[PDB]
Swiss-Prot record, chains A, B:
The protein's name: Cytochrome c-552
Binding-site list for heme c: 10, 13-14, 62
Entry comment on modification after translation: Binds 1 heme c group covalently per subunit.
Key words, A-Z: Electron transport, Heme, Iron, Metal-binding, Signal, Transport
Family named by the database record: Belongs to the cytochrome c family.
Coverage span on the entire protein: 19 to 98 of 98
Function comment: Reacts with hydrogenase.
MF terms (GO), sorted A to Z: electron transfer activity; heme binding; iron ion binding
Record's keyword annotation contains Iron: yes
Length: 83, 83
């Protein structure tokens, strides 16, 4: 399974899918660093995940995503936790 | 959480951290595409995982991995499942 592969060190040499390093959106660790000082980061990011947005990291927009309000908040919190 | 983000499609457009794209081995989805539906795929891949391999995807070899035969079979089956 995926967790076993992580534990065994496999992911030092392998990604799940191709295209690493060339994606259209920002790295989550950079999102986490940016908003570390921001008290309302969770709701700000949840809004962007659900409703989409542009201009914060580049000119290409993130389209609105198929997530509930609760999921958007959960994803925001997880991203903020990334170190 | 991490699994939720993967399941929702977020990772098509985002990496977890900066510096992606330099892994030395093939992406698992590409391994899965190659060997999908071959009658000996599980045994073949389990053997490469455990014993290592060279020259199938490039010049850089995979060393033997610290896995049991059962774990190698588990890992092979998981990799073959990656869409
Ligand atoms: C942790 C136990 C794993 C698992 C499950 C896999 N790998 Fe590797 N791998 C690496 C390289 C350079 C290759 C290509 C070798 C070649 O050109 O022949 C591979 C290949 C694979 C495969 C496909 C094998 C095939 O013949 O098609 C598979 C299923 C696979 N790996 C699984 C490099 C590395 C590492 C670099 C030091 C390490 C660590 C791992 N791999 C670990 C694992
Ligand atoms: C799956 C539900 C997700 C989640 C959890 C996130 N994204 Fe994206 N995203 C994309 C692009 C181009 C941007 C930059 C937009 C801009 O310049 O403003 C983003 C941005 C984000 C953020 C940061 C938002 C901010 O204002 O700081 C976050 C937290 C985030 N995303 C999470 C592109 C895409 C996609 C391309 C089609 C898709 C799919 C996703 N993102 C999916 C998700």
């Amino acid at each position: 399974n995926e967790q076993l592969a992580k534990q065994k060190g496999c992911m030092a040499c392998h990604d799940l899918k191709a295209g690493g390093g060339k994606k259209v959106g920002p790295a989550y660790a950079d999102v986490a660093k940016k908003y570390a000082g921001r008290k309302d980061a969770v709701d700000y990011l949840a809004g962007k995940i659900k409703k989409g947005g542009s201009g914060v990291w580049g000119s290409v927009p993130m389209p609105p995503q198929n997530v509930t309000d609760a999921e958007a908040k959960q994803l925001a919190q997880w991203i903020l936790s990334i170190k």
